[PDB]
Amino acid sequence: TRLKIVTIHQEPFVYVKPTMSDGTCKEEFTVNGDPVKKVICTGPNDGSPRHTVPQCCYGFCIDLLIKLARTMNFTYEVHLVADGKFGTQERVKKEWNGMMGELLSGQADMIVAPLTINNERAQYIEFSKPFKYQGLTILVKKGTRITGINDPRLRNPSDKFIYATVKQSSVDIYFRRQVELSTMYRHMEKHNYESAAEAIQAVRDNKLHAFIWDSAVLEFEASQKCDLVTTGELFFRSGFGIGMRKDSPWKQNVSLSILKSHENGFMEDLDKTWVRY
Amino acid sequence: DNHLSIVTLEEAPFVIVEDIDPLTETCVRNTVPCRKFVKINNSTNEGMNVKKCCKGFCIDILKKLSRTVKFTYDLYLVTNGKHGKKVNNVWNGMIGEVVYQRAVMAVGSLTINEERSEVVDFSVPFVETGISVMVSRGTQVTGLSDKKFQRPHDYSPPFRFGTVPNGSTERNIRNNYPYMHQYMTRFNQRGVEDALVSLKTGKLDAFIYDAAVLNYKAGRDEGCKLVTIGYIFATTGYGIALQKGSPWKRQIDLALLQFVGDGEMEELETLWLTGIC
Ligand SMILES: Cc1cc(C)c2c(O)cc(C(=O)O)nc2c1
Numbered sequence: 001t002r003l004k005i006v007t008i009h010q011e012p013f014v015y016v017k018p019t020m021s022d023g024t025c026k027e028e029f030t031v032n033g034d035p036v037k038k039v040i041c042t043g044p045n046d047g048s049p050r051h052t053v054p055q056c057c058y059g060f061c062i063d064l065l066i067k068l069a070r071t072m073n074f075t076y077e078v079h080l081v082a083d084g085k086f087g088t089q090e091r092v093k094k095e096w097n098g099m100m101g102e103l104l105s106g107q108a109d110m111i112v113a114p115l116t117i118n119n120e121r122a123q124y125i126e127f128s129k130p131f132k133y134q135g136l137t138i139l140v141k142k143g144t145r146i147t148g149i150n151d152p153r154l155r156n157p158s159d160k161f162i163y164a165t166v167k168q169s170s171v172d173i174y175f176r177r178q179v180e181l182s183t184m185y186r187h188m189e190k191h192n193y194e195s196a197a198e199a200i201q202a203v204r205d206n207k208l209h210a211f212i213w214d215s216a217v218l219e220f221e222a223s224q225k226c227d228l229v230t231t232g233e234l235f236f237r238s239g240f241g242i243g244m245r246k247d248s249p250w251k252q253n254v255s256l257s258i259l260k261s262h263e264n265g266f267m268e269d270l271d272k273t274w275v276r277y
Numbered sequence: 278d279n280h281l282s283i284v285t286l287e288e289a290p291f292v293i294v295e296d297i298d299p300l301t302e303t304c305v306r307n308t309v310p311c312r313k314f315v316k317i318n319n320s321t322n323e324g325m326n327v328k329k330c331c332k333g334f335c336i337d338i339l340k341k342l343s344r345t346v347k348f349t350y351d352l353y354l355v356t357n358g359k360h361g362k363k364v365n366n367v368w369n370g371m372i373g374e375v376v377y378q379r380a381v382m383a384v385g386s387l388t389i390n391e392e393r394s395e396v397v398d399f400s401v402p403f404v405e406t407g408i409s410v411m412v413s414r415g416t417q418v419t420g421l422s423d424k425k426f427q428r429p430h431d432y433s434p435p436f437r438f439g440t441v442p443n444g445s446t447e448r449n450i451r452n453n454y455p456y457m458h459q460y461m462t463r464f465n466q467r468g469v470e471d472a473l474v475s476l477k478t479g480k481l482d483a484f485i486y487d488a489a490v491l492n493y494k495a496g497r498d499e500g501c502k503l504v505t506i507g508y509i510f511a512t513t514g515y516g517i518a519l520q521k522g523s524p525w526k527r528q529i530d531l532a533l534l535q536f537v538g539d540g541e542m543e544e545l546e547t548l549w550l551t552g553i554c
Pocket residue numbers: 010011013086087114115116117169170171214216217
């Protein structure tokens with residue numbers, strides 16, 4: 001009766017590292033003196049044969065899982081999503097992939113990861129109240145001033161100020177969907193990068209002036225300190241929630257425990273541990 | 278039946294109350310009808326319902342929900358308390374109206390917390406909020422959890438700070454920081470307007486209150502002297518409160534997330550909550 005937890009590699013929520021030679025996880029420490037709590041999470045390493053191996057998982061969402069498990073008295077085992085995706089609906093009877101598909105098929109009983117709460121997913125699964133707010137922001141070289149999604153250099157684009165996101169990413173899809181972002185979308189389309197890592201160096205390399213991406217990740221990328229920086233107000237806000245099936249008996253208590261944790265400062269401690277730089 | 282009793286509470290810019298046109302008795306433009314029970318005198322509880330008009334961020338939310346979830350409503354302003362407090366084991370305010378089945382739902386600047394969630398169901402949060410701190414520009418504090426608040430008789434002279442009593446903010450401080458809480462009572466403010474005056478004229482050093490309202494107020498403070506620290510502690514949201522087990526909760530959640538997905542929440546936020554500061 002161990003709950004099967006599915007997660008995904010997404011820093012700083014979930015770090016995934018190889019085990020040491022004896023198969024244990026390296027003992028490490030947080031920014032405050034605290035020991036980093038690590039769990040073994042099995043999953044693929046790298047077309048590919050998807051050979052499953054014990055790996056070390058830690059971070060915001062792992063700390064949360066450990067708290068939840070304690071609080072609600074459940075045991076668990078953690079694995080990484082086999083296809084490496086959060087989850088979208090696709091066809092060829094439409095079917096969810098990623099963590100969404102694993103939860104619905106029974107391969108997982110709970111999704112503990114920065115899983116964006118949205119209408120399409122909520123039609124199928126239950127989200128907890130948010131354990132963390134979600135939004136987009138902008139990544140630029142230090143010294144650049146962008147106000148947010150309503151800045152004239154974004155609203156009225158030219159090749160003098162090039163902005164983009166990752167091709168076919170969740171952000172790209174979101175932008176294509178809004179007719180009011182059309183003019184903004186045609187500019188991005190011509191400049192979108194293949195991966196976040198390829199977008200970010202481009203910002204370092206003055207090849208791309210602004211990268212639009214998840215806010216938590218961008219502050220983290222910026223935390224290197226500091227040829228890069230984040231600018232403006234967050235936009236297109238939502239939240240990250242624990243995902244469960246509609247008939248889960250744990251769902252109300254998971255949500256209540258998350259509210260309790262926001263209210264007593266536990267979540268701020270996590271913010272200080274993993275997302276405050 | 279799909280004609281619903283719905284309770285609200287004035288709090289700009291979330292719910293703003295206007296006098297109705299005496300020559301028409303019809304609410305117009307972006308307003309909707311809302312009634313308020315007003316006593317004839319202080320001898321008895323005899324009163325009359327007064328026809329007024331309501332508008333604001335939450336009213337636009339209500340109108341949209343009315344359309345996509347397909348219900349009509351009779352909106353009234355609560356007169357028994359404010360947002361919600363449990364007094365002698367009996368909930369008052371908007372929460373009380375829902376708990377005691379006087380209202381099918383409560384719409385307004387109603388903060389989701391754990392104790393409320395025990396007696397009502399909340400929708401997904403539709404505005405980010407939590408607890409913030411407002412000061413005059415220059416004053417140094419980090420946030421609620423700051424030791425300048427936690428041990429106010431450390432630090433000389435003693436910091437002067439207060440909240441508006443009986444809402445989620447006081448409830449949080451009372452539970453988390455007993456010393457800070459009993460120290461603040463001296464500086465309790467009757468309302469947000471009083472508090473902002475107390476700050477600007479140096480009678481108060483900090484005002485601890487709902488983040489969404491403080492941010493809005495900072496955004497339009499004359500001269501931009503009042504600012505919010507950093508930040509938000511105990512991040513939660515405003516939620517629509519519904520009776521436990523309510524048949525309306527699922528469609529309301531899906532519709533709110535639909536609004537997020539179609540960019541409409543982002544639009545509403547810039548419409549009602551945009552600041553000049
Ligand atoms: C922290 C983080 C960062 C990114 C880039 C995400 C994403 O692209 C999708 C999703 C998703 O589909 O839920 N979540 C993300 C979470």
